[PDB]
Design a protein around this ligand. Structure first.
Ligand SMILES: CC(=O)N[C@H]1[C@H]([C@H](O)[C@H](O)CO)O[C@@](OC[C@H]2O[C@@H](O)[C@H](O)[C@@H](O)[C@H]2O)(C(=O)O)C[C@@H]1O
Ligand SMILES: CC(=O)N[C@H]1[C@H]([C@H](O)[C@H](O)CO)O[C@@](OC[C@H]2O[C@@H](O)[C@H](O)[C@@H](O)[C@H]2O)(C(=O)O)C[C@@H]1O
Ligand SMILES: CC(=O)N[C@H]1[C@H]([C@H](O)[C@H](O)CO)O[C@@](OC[C@H]2O[C@@H](O)[C@H](O)[C@@H](O)[C@H]2O)(C(=O)O)C[C@@H]1O
Ligand SMILES: *[C@@H]1O[C@H](CO)[C@@H](O)[C@H](O)[C@H]1NC(C)=O
Ligand SMILES: *[C@@H]1O[C@H](CO)[C@@H](O)[C@H](O)[C@H]1NC(C)=O
Ligand SMILES: *[C@@H]1O[C@H](CO)[C@@H](O)[C@H](O)[C@H]1NC(C)=O
Lengths: 321, 164, 164, 164, 321, 321
């Protein structure tokens, strides 16, 4: 006869979702909110290209390891990529004060501008072109870190140094220098004449006195000697004052901080792909409209939200027999 | 089924209704057919659209992990750093998965609710003028032309229509 | 409406009933009137009072931020400190907003439930003795004095009362 | 009661039914008795078993606190460490208690749902052949032998069975 | 004829709440659980008044910057208020060891009691009333930090100092002292005769040796010299031992810690209102029965729960057409 | 006549659960998910027994406090138990560099193997069996820390020491040594002849110079002198180099790290029960199938999840009148 019936939609989709009381439930329509794919590349970030340290560390770059000449001048970057174990670091064995604190500063910077603050030619009463070592070779010849100069005596004499540089720029200056720790008293006089030496350094803020440690150590990269490096941020119109009668590894080039900004130091073995992206992870870039992802927690750019899941599916439709 | 409509007293779904989530199926003098209830289909599409967007908006400021490094004599704060970032990324993973499990359910019971509320839209109109078959269908005590179906399909059905 | 009572088959609300959340409206021989169902009004006020207090009690030990300072060479732990305190204050902001969104809903569907459960309190008593109009009202097959309304209003209505 | 079945129109529980959560109680010619509806009892045991296990599985990777110590001049990071571990252990305590409160409720309303869905399983079968007493029981317009009870108890009841 | 009807409440309130599936929903009754108003003042906390450092820093207060005399004696406080950039700090340029660690201790203290542990008059063989500087002026005249005394030579002589103080109180003692770093060897002898000097300090727990750093630095507040300050907590019945042959900035006043307790160091430009409260934020006090608030996360007292939201409204009533 | 009725289960259980809208609700069946009981003992963990420092600290153990002989040789452990205030620590007053950082390393280790890296008999030109003190008594007689030797002069002479040890093992070496800070110049010469002394120490990585601080300090355990101890991890095939002309507290025994692994340092006054467990807390072990517990947050082993609650009950059954 006559009839009327109330029913509901159904279709052919096999997609399943979960609820609290039941898993693997098939539905008519769903929405996956979890991006699970990247391009496996290291891309530019919104058109600004990353700085990919290759087999160089931050220290090798900033100090100017001769094996790191690729980075002598470096344009504005978006983020920095460093390998887990860069082979080019401190060619001359030693240490780098407050290194992780510097690395952190770097994640807050987008561009350095290398400038010569004390030319190697200005040293009239000390030797400046003999500060080289087999530990730091360039094309097979003994060399050294490019941005600092290892001064030694001249005509059997090391007059005490009084050098001063005033930051007359409008940008903060990253200034690096070092001290050399010999292996015995003979080496000390051989390099510097003076047996008992020091290096004082002052700014508005900094007030340090360094004395070299002449002592017996185990050979690293062939040497028992050590080079120990220091740094500071020189604020505009402040000056830095060096006084030393030996073991001084004087600055030559320093870095104007021309662009503070949001940045990062990615640990990744990957290298430069040739691409652009809005979201970059250390294992590859992301291009998605998804609100979530599961690729890597350490990320940079306008990215989805990281989550440890392998599947996250929202149910929009209804049950389906 | 929490309301018992879907897969309860109604055994299954109507493949032939490619017009929406809820609707009808008549069979009078002038033939059979399907018609999507654009009414409850709208208060449902409004539901899940707002639901999806709310789940997403509730978690746009979540937790970002930044890279920090520590030397060989900073193993304590390094561990603190590690577990504190693992910490937040665990709770937010919990928050996401748990909100999905809980809202997938309130989603299914929502479609069950709407069907239960549509069968009751018709049932509360054709009181004596029909018999509730109980499988989801009704059978009329009079003939119901293609203009009789429409009056039910939009909310105002006229009771003056005799019996048996 | 999840149960479909409020704003479903009952088009709107009764302004004239300033006596509670749920109630009645009769119109017999001795006049019209309103009466608040103090029964279901109580199991409802008990509901939201406990709900409010539970939402508050679940979050009395939350997360306090204390002030710590760091020098120019402690930028790592300073950032750790910053993001760790921002971290907890974000999740607790999420927890508060999300619990409100979820319980505002279970609140509205709770009033819908009670109305659906009151219409069924009356419907499961006046079986043949009345006709379900379907707009929320019933019409008697006998006269119902002001003492007949009260028996329904407190739970025990006598079936022996003839038909048509 | 959100669906109003349990402790609503059905005043209480049947002690004599030690066979499951939902069932029946008949009284025909051949005596009385109880029978557990193994149908809805199964879709219920499936419910809470998965629910318990989901609550547990959602929180197997939670937050572990490890022991770290600090000297007299590390009071800042010590406090950071303290409050960061107290922090996570507070939110997870919140997450546990809150998930229990919320799912204990959806558990009770789930049993209410099933009863409401079983009374409607029978009601949508014995349309005219019985009268809904409204206290949870039905009364037949014919005699119902011990083979008549079974047909209702497994889903297919035959309508051809006269009236009054 | 006769009728019976079941319905629900309704009224005139326009208040709205949100749910997951729907925003801006009007209801009969609601409850706002978010306090969004403060008094914009810095009040007493339950009747105990805060300590409002004005243009003085913690260091200026504790060391006794002459421009900080307002705080020479300071009653029990409830919390401490410091400006973001106090102008009165280290009038004589230099540094303050473990300053943030001291600041943290302060948030655990409610009252100091200044006491004279080494009177300025007790120095028989050194000058004690000439230790002043233009960097630290008081009413236009050269002065110095009040709680420490800058000793110099007397009759062209600086005998080595052996001074000792035993904490015979039942409270912990906060003891401050300093060393002076000159700018050249001439200044060193001009102040102290002895060219090569030191300051040793010992307790049960402390065992330090300080040597001044004579070096060239950039002028700050007119000077190239520096003053560097140290501190320790002296436990009851422990003693502190000073030995020095120059550059010693000796203690005179120290602080008995008479009241440990819960406290704070608020950063706020605000100053003393004239009020009382149970809950104080850095931008104003709170008086509320609300369980939440959105004013400031750093708070002190019995306060609501901080939350980043701008609205949080709970639905008590029901839907309203 | 004939009837059919739909109903639900009920029983006699009084157990209650909570919901958001209602507390103390009785049900038919429930499940408690909160373990609230421990055995009040310190057990083995899966058959490997803990190391229970008794009245000895980590420092007393590792340095070899004579009152700590119980731990001269110590088998593989599962976790370490230390009292809140061990009475046997630094018998000779002084300090221990980077102690908490060492303690953390320990929670990453399961077994040390004590080995003699410089025998006490090898010192031909210094005294090695007179380095004892009343501060460190053994059975009533003056003694010292067992793992290090306090060298003094011999025949009114202290030739400068050049000692070197090469880690020829395949395991990392924990190596401890110290410096002695005298109380006056007389004591310095009485012990070491040389008035001005130092101790240099080098590895691949380490490059330190220590000079003793001769100064007046308050008596602790009867002495004004101090012993200050240092440590390092010697990597396989690296060597450590000591040079000193006084105040050197030379190593004798060191620790091969033979088993890295997951571990802990529990603070507990409890001592060795005689039992085994899968989950150990500082106030007692746990044996449970419960998913949660409320006993102690710091835990080790396959344990339930810690939660601050006192009751957590899940509702499995239904309502019960
Ligand atoms: C500026 C200078 O003197 N460069 C030397 C360098 C330094 O003298 C030395 O590094 C001191 O720090 O010495 C170098 O030759 C080192 C050479 O010496 C042998 O005795 C040793 O056995 C070899 O392994 C090797 O170290 C050097 O190259 O670093 C030479 C350099 O000219
Ligand atoms: C105790 C004492 O000698 N106070 C002197 C002070 C000290 O000598 C000086 O600070 C060393 O640390 O010197 C002060 O005068 C400094 C004055 O000297 C000029 O040469 C310089 O060009 C000026 O800018 C100014 O620094 C001082 O006031 O601090 C005087 C004080 O009497
Ligand atoms: C190696 C050695 O010389 N051991 C001495 C020890 C040291 O000389 C001393 O610790 C220097 O650091 O001295 C001890 O006797 C100390 C004894 O001296 C009295 O003057 C003092 O008043 C006493 O309290 C007490 O300190 C010592 O036992 O430590 C003796 C030891 O033989
Ligand atoms: C640096 O140069 C400017 C301008 O010549 C000068 O005023 C300033 O004082 C200098 N800085 C220092 C610290 O000498
Ligand atoms: C301080 O004084 C008390 C009592 O005079 C004395 O016993 C104690 O040893 C002294 N403290 C020191 C370290 O000298
Ligand atoms: C340690 O011994 C090995 C083998 O004898 C040697 O090759 C190595 O260089 C030594 N280490 C040092 C640092 O001398």
């Amino acid at each position: 006869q006559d009839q009327i019936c109330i029913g509901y939609h159904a279709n052919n989709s096999t997609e399943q979702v979960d609820t609290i009381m039941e898993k693997n439930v098939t539905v008519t329509h769903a929405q996956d909110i979890l991006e699970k794919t990247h391009n496996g590349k290291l891309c530019d970030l919104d058109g600004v290209k990353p700085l990919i340290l290759r087999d160089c560390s931050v220290a090798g770059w900033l100090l100017g390891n001769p094996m790191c000449d690729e980075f002598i001048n470096v344009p504005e970057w978006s983020y920095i990529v460093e390998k887990a174990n860069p082979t080019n670091d401190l060619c001359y064995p030693g240490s780098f004060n407050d290194y992780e604190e510097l690395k952190y500063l770097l994640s807050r910077i987008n561009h350095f501008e290398k400038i010569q603050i004390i030319p190697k030619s200005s040293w009239s009463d000390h030797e400046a072109s003999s500060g080289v070592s087999s530990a730091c070779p360039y094309l097979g010849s003994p060399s050294f870190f490019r941005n600092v100069v290892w001064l030694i005596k001249k005509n059997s004499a090391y007059p005490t140094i009084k050098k001063s540089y005033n930051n007359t720029n409008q940008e903060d200056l990253l200034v690096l220098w070092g001290i050399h720790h010999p292996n015995d008293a003979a080496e000390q006089t051989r390099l510097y004449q003076n047996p008992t030496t020091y290096i004082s350094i002052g700014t508005s803020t900094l007030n340090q006195r360094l004395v070299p440690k002449i002592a017996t150590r185990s050979k690293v990269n062939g040497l028992s000697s050590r080079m120990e490096f220091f740094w500071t941020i020189l604020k505009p119109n402040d000056a830095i004052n060096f006084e030393s009668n030996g073991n001084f590894i004087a600055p030559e080039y320093a870095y104007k901080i021309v662009k503070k900004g949001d940045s990062a130091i990615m640990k990744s073995e990957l290298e430069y792909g040739n691409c652009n992206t809005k979201c970059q992870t250390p294992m590859g870039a992301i291009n998605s409209s998804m609100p979530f992802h599961n690729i890597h927690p350490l990320t940079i750019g306008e990215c989805p939200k990281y989550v440890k899941s392998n599947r996250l599916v929202l149910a929009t439709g209804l049950r389906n027999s | 089924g929490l309301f018992g409509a879907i897969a309860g007293f109604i055994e299954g779904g109507w493949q032939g209704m490619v017009d929406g989530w809820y609707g009808y199926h008549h069979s009078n003098e002038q033939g059979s057919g399907y018609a999507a209830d654009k009414e409850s289909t709208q208060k449902a599409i409004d539901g899940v659209t707002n639901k999806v967007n709310s789940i997403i908006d509730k978690m746009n400021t979540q937790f970002e992990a930044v890279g920090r490094e520590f030397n060989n004599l900073e193993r304590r704060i390094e561990n603190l750093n590690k577990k504190m970032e693992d910490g937040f990324l665990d709770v937010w993973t919990y928050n996401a998965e748990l909100l999905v499990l809980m809202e997938n359910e309130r989603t299914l019971d929502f479609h069950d609710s709407n069907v239960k509320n549509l069968y009751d839209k018709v049932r509360l109109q054709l009181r004596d003028n029909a018999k509730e078959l109980g499988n989801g269908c009704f059978e009329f005590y009079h003939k119901c032309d293609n203009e009789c179906m429409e009056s039910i399909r939009n909310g105002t059905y006229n009771y003056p229509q005799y019996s048996e």
